[PDB]
Amino acid sequence: ANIVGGIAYSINNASLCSVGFSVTRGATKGFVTAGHCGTVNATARIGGAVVGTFAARVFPGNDRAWVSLTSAQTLLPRVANGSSFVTVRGSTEAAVGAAVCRSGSTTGYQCGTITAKNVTANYAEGAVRGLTQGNACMGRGDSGGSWITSAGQAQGVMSGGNVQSNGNNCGIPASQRSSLFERLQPILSQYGLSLVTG
């Protein structure tokens, strides 16, 4: 399969989440995603085919993971934007007030601004701290998906937010949205990963 940020993948033939970013760890191919998406050794599938397994994760406390892929997979420095693509050019962290977009299987490509940093989410499983907050909308299934600036700077991976009864927060104004992502930089350093860029 071609690995592109924002596309759907399944975990152990059950849950559905979104790809974060293509990465390498030496000769090993992979992608980063959210930790709540799967446990270590869980099997990831794209288009019905096994593509790899969860190599490591932290959730809760943090919300990060990476999936170790078979050599047959094709890593790409891209994030889905409809039929088009946003090129991943680096991982410069944007400041509060910056415009940012996110890509996921459920709500697709959505944009907003970064509104706060170091936010704590109180999930069913426990607290996750240090999250960055934006007001781009999102829905269930967008978890793990890319957050990236239009200029191609990868920001992090979708963790969660204040979804409504319809499963997303698209139906409320941006001013009322809390869409939270896990910063990319600590994921890269924790697992010794390098971002695939173009």
What distance in Å separates the CA atoms of residue 191 and residue 31, rounded to the nearest whole number?
A: 11
Residue located via tokens 């406390």 = 61
Query: Do 35 and 49 fall within a single domain?
Result: yes
Q: Which of 18, 63, 68, 159 is catalytic?
A: 63
Q: Provide the CATH number for the domain around residue 24.
A: 2.40.10.10
Tokens of 25: 């760890």
C-alpha triplet 80, 29, 106: angle, nearest 5°: 30
Query: Do 71 and 117 fall within a single domain?
Result: no
Q: Which of 36, 68, 105, 159 is catalytic?
A: 36
Sign of CA dihedral 33, 41, 188, 185: positive
Per the structure, the count of domains in the chain is 2
Are the C-beta atoms of 163 and 138 separated by less than 8 Å?
Answer: yes
Q: Which of 68, 143, 146, 179 is catalytic?
A: 143
Which residues on neighbouring strands pair with residue 179, listed in sequence order? 134, 161
Query: Do 162 and 70 fall within a single domain?
Result: no
Tokens of 167: 């499963």
Hey, what's the torsion of the CAs at 46, 86, 179, 60, to 10 degrees? 50
Are the C-beta atoms of 44 and 54 separated by less than 8 Å?
Answer: yes
Query: Do 110 and 62 fall within a single domain?
Result: no
Query: Do 82 and 177 fall within a single domain?
Result: yes
Query: Do 175 and 98 fall within a single domain?
Result: yes
Read off φ and ψ for residue 185, nearest 5 degrees.
-55, -50
Annotation marks residue 143 as catalytic = yes
Name the structure determination technique. Answer: X-ray
Domain range enclosing 103: 77-183
The one-letter amino acid code at 31 reads F
CA nearest 8: which of 147, 100, 110, 107?
107
Tokens of 180: 């939270």
